[PDB]
Amino acid sequence: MKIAGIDEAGRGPVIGPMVIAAVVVDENSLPKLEELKVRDSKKLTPKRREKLFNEILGVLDDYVILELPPDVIGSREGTLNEFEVENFAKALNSLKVKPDVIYADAADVDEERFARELGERLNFEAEVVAKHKADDIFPVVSAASILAKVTRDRAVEKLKEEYGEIGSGYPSDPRTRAFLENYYREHGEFPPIVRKGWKTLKKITQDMIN
């Protein structure tokens, strides 16, 4: 039986993309995955993590990595939860190898409504197992977290080369606020790297520049 795990990166930051990774592994390939200590990846360095990335791929029957830029996210014609569910589904419906069981990281509490919302959005037959904040609980979801996280890091490390110190990218991080604030100064507008929608972006315009 085919097993899939799905996770997503960049949900909280206000600058940068949001990556959704879905992977499909085989019932007999599961072992080789835990042998990679995927759960114990939070400790690894970016380079060692990137090493894990290429190894995960080599043991997966199939995988998809969706990357959502801030312009797409900050322009959804609906809610945010909806955005995830739809993208989590598109990602799965893109898997050439269809899974029978899918273990997903519930974008928010009430993992049952999430598991249902996604189900009715699958163009194929499969059962879903959602868990809010699946902290390394499901090895299949851990591997998806890696690919989504590596992909995100690369996109951010490139944003630094074009803008410099952009901070952690979180709306609650002053360094990111300064950066935007200062940028919103000599340009009157925000960089094409921010999700024009976060209430955070509001205060920035009222604090400085009055």
> CA–CA separation, 92 vs 35, rounded Å?
25
204 Cβ contact list (under 8 Å, min separation 6): 177, 180, 181, 184, 190
> CA–CA separation, 168 vs 158, rounded Å?
13
Q: Which regions of the chain carry the CATH code 1.10.10.460? A: 162-208
Distances (CA, A) of 148 to 92, 154, 187: 14, 10, 32
Binding residue positions for a divalent metal cation: 7-8, 105
SS3 14: coil
Binding residue positions: 7-8, 105
> CA–CA separation, 56 vs 33, rounded Å?
7
Distances (CA, A) of 26 to 1, 3, 107, 140, 165: 7, 6, 25, 10, 42
> CA–CA separation, 169 vs 66, rounded Å?
20
Q: Which regions of the chain carry the CATH code 3.30.420.10? A: 2-161
Both tokens of 191, joined, read 């960089």
> CA–CA separation, 22 vs 96, rounded Å?
11
B/e letters for 14-42, b = 16+ CB within 10 Å, e = fewer, are: bbbbbbbbbbbbbeeeeeebeebebbebe
Residue 146: name the closest of 61, 69, 73, 40 by CA: 40
200 Cβ contact list (under 8 Å, min separation 6): 14, 171, 172, 177
The CATH number for 162-208, chosen from 1.10.490.10, 3.30.420.40, 1.10.10.460, 3.40.50.300, is 1.10.10.460
The CATH number for 2-161, chosen from 3.90.660.10, 2.40.30.10, 3.30.420.10, 3.60.15.10, is 3.30.420.10
> CA–CA separation, 109 vs 169, rounded Å?
24
Are 65 and 21 within 8 A, CB to CB? yes
Resolution in A: 2.7
Interior angle at CA 39, CA 156 and CA 172, nearest 5: 40
Distances (CA, A) of 17 to 70, 109, 115, 137: 5, 23, 24, 25
